């Protein structure tokens, strides 16, 4: 029982640490707002900085788009192969049945 309460305390430590790390994972985008925080500090004409941030975001989004497209093609490939094996198995199984 003593070891078990100790293990429960250790599990609580792990839980809190993991929850904190997850929370920062969620706030991942917020760290990108460092530009937004710096931009907001302009307190004056700041449309050019907005446009620069928008261009950077466009570049990032295009990179992510290409990454997603190629990954989708790879997954598709995988999927087809998986189906071709399924059919080959079905057919081999049916021929085992018949023989």
């Amino acid at each position: 029982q003593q070891d078990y309460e100790t293990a429960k305390h250790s599990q609580h430590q792990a839980k809190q640490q993991a929850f904190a790390l997850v929370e920062i994972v969620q706030r991942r985008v917020h760290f990108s707002y460092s530009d937004s925080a710096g931009m907001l500090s302009e307190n004056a004409d700041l449309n050019d900085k907005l446009r620069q941030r928008l261009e950077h975001a466009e570049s990032d989004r295009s990179r992510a788009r290409e990454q997603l497209r190629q990954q989708q093609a790879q997954y598709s490939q995988f999927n087809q192969v998986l189906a071709s094996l399924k059919s080959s198995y079905e057919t081999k199984q049916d021929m085992l049945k018949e023989l």
Binding site: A7, K15, I24, R51, L54, A57, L68, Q71, Y75
Partner: protein, 148 residues
């Protein structure tokens, strides 16, 4: 019969193949979903900035909210560096420590799970332990309870 045997082998082979492909497909779909979410978030932010520039009457309200979010994220990052005691930490590589401590938490939970089972079976009264101990003694001879 031999031919049948051959076909058996073949089928085994395709079984294995299928297994592997299944796994592969699973990981590929996982990555596809992750990148879908990331791209969706990036395009949402892009559209938000598009509206901000087009609707400059927005009047930096979104900018204020984003700065507040940045401060909150700074606070959260400091809090994690404290709790996890990882001054060496960054948003980009925090995922690695997250999965490491996920493994840590899984180890702790599996431990405590075996512990829960052992405690639950510890409800067995004192008599059962005595009887089993004496049975093992009578069969093998005197033995320690730990070795019993």
């Amino acid at each position: 019969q031999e031919k049948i045997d051959r076909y058996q082998v073949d089928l085994e082979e395709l079984s294995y193949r299928l297994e592997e492909q299944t796994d592969v497909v699973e990981e590929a779909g996982e990555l596809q979903a992750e990148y879908e979410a990331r791209t969706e978030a990036t395009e949402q932010e892009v559209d938000e900035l598009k509206s901000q520039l087009a609707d400059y009457q927005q009047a930096l309200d979104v900018q204020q909210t984003r700065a507040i979010q940045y401060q909150q994220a700074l606070q959260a990052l400091e809090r994690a560096r404290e709790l996890c005691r990882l001054p060496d930490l960054s948003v980009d590589n925090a995922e690695e420590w997250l999965e490491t401590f996920q493994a840590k938490e899984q180890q702790a939970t599996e431990a405590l799970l075996a512990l829960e089972q052992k405690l639950s079976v510890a409800d067995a009264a004192h008599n059962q332990f005595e009887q089993a101990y004496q049975l093992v003694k009578n069969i093998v001879g005197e033995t320690s309870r730990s070795e019993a």
